[PDB]
Symmetry: C2
Subunit: 313 residues, 2 copies
């Protein structure tokens, strides 16, 4: 099963109970964005991140009464149609708001049962993706495909290190390709125990395909209330990219000297084949539109891995 989260007086995580940390329900988010939850029917704002006032520019109480209808007039009917009752928690809808306080915000919404989860992040506003797609497809074998993928991602993102991390049948991981800035350790060829990515994190990574830590020293921002009014239970945040990263894993990143971390799941035959794993030495908020490019690349790599593995077997 899972332990209760901390804020419901559950045990603190150690290397003895790695498998039982409820990483999906931390009750908090990373501070480079803001999150609201809301009722599926009424559009009634039920929870907000204590930092919402910053991003939205709204007097705190104003929000926690109001309706999405009021708050987001153009958007609220689109949401209603895009995310019908009963849809999967994996389905997401995005829009760009030109919002008074903040030039442009990206809005990302998904639905978990009766709750809409809304994420707001700063945003903005060429051929590198098309060029990359063809490059991946003409790679002659899996090894070269891995090399092209890591190089392409590094060029698109500027990340200090990009790896392709492949899982063995026992969930033992191996760095099979790597693109990195001059003057970093090389993790190419190294293998790592399955417990570094514990079972409950691999399962969530099979369904929700991109996650990140933007700053491995930033404090999480609580949800208020912490419990969902609807249920008097924790809000599931595993489909939210703003979801606070497990401190156990933030500690693992700080000990490596990493300030910023992102990965994309590569999913083949319904199973987690590997990760595009990215490191930055300093804090780094990759903007939403560039993340989208990596999300596309994730799908394309999933296709090409199967194609390429089929021409060996």
């Amino acid at each position: 099963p899972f332990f209760p989260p901390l804020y419901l007086g559950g045990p603190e995580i150690t290397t003895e109970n790695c498998e039982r940390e409820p990483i999906h329900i931390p009750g908090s988010i990373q501070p480079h964005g803001a999150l609201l939850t809301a009722d599926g029917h009424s559009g009634e704002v039920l929870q907000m991140s204590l930092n919402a006032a910053t991003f939205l520019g709204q007097e705190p109480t104003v929000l926690r009464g109001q309706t999405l209808a009021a708050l987001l007039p153009e958007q609220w009917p689109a949401l209603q149609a895009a995310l019908p009752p009963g849809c999967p928690d994996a389905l997401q809808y995005r829009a760009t708001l030109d919002w008074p306080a903040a030039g442009h915000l990206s809005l990302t919404v998904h639905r978990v049962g009766e709750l809409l989860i809304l994420e707001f992040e700063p945003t903005e506003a060429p051929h590198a993706l098309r060029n990359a797609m063809f490059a991946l497809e003409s790679a002659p074998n899996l090894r070269a495909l891995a090399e092209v993928a890591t190089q392409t991602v590094r060029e698109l993102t500027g990340f200090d290190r990009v790896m392709l991390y492949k899982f063995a049948p026992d969930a033992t991981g191996e760095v099979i390709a790597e693109a990195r800035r001059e003057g970093l350790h090389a993790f190419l060829g190294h293998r790592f125990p399955a417990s570094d990515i514990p079972a409950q994190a691999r399962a969530l990574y099979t369904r929700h395909l991109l996650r990140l830590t933007a700053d491995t020293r930033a404090a999480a921002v609580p949800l208020d209330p912490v419990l969902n009014p609807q249920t008097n239970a924790p809000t599931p945040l595993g489909g939210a990219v703003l979801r606070a990263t497990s401190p156990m894993h933030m500690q693992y990143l700080r000990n490596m000297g990493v300030g910023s971390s992102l990965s994309v799941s590569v999913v083949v035959g319904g199973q987690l084949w590997g990760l595009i794993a990215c490191h930055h030495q300093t804090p780094y908020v990759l903007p939403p539109d560039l993340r989208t490019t990596l999300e596309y690349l994730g799908r394309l790599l999933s296709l090409q891995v199967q194609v390429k593995e089929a021409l060996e077997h």
Copy 2:
């Protein structure tokens, strides 16, 4: 019966009838569609060899001036990028794309690929979260039918085409329209089947490697390359990888007879075989700009993946 290609018309080959469909050498028509321009150049020196006859009007230069310069001089910023992206021996399927600001012609999209020692350069005029939203909707579709319906509707919304169909090949290469989105008033093609010769065997092979082709105007005359043969080889210039390549006259007559002014199709490739086609029709001529066509190319790949996934959920 499968038989080798006839020589093209310009090398004294025969004219194509219902009898000899499968032997038309559609990859080497010696000509392009008039809404863009094409140059060929030597892959090592960058000497310009062939150009479409309309090139002066896209590029704003006399032929003899174009042909008298190397790509190093014509494309000083792109020439080194081309050479890195398209190394000798690379496959003909690999494409490099850039946007140019050309004085006379505005923003041009440049698409380049390499066939042996030849570079092929295509120039076309070029111009929010719809793709991301579509990607997730496709993935959440519960079964093959719902996927097919979401895919057709999405493509129609992105493009404004009068008809978008998902055409699926059977094992005998006959095809069936298994989903479609269509303009009000058009008659349904859903559930209809069409014989294997409708898309002959040398088109199907080409459609497994080069995943998008189009006819922007089913009545437009093709524009010859000049000279027609590659001076490197005194042989035909391979245009199978060029979206500008002229469509087979057989296929154009087939489309005009259906009342179609514009056609586009994307290949859906599963396990190395052509599974089906995203096939679009417009009643009037219609040019879809290169950046919009890129969205369809990306959806072609997504759909190939999702078709595998939906079919595996099915035994």
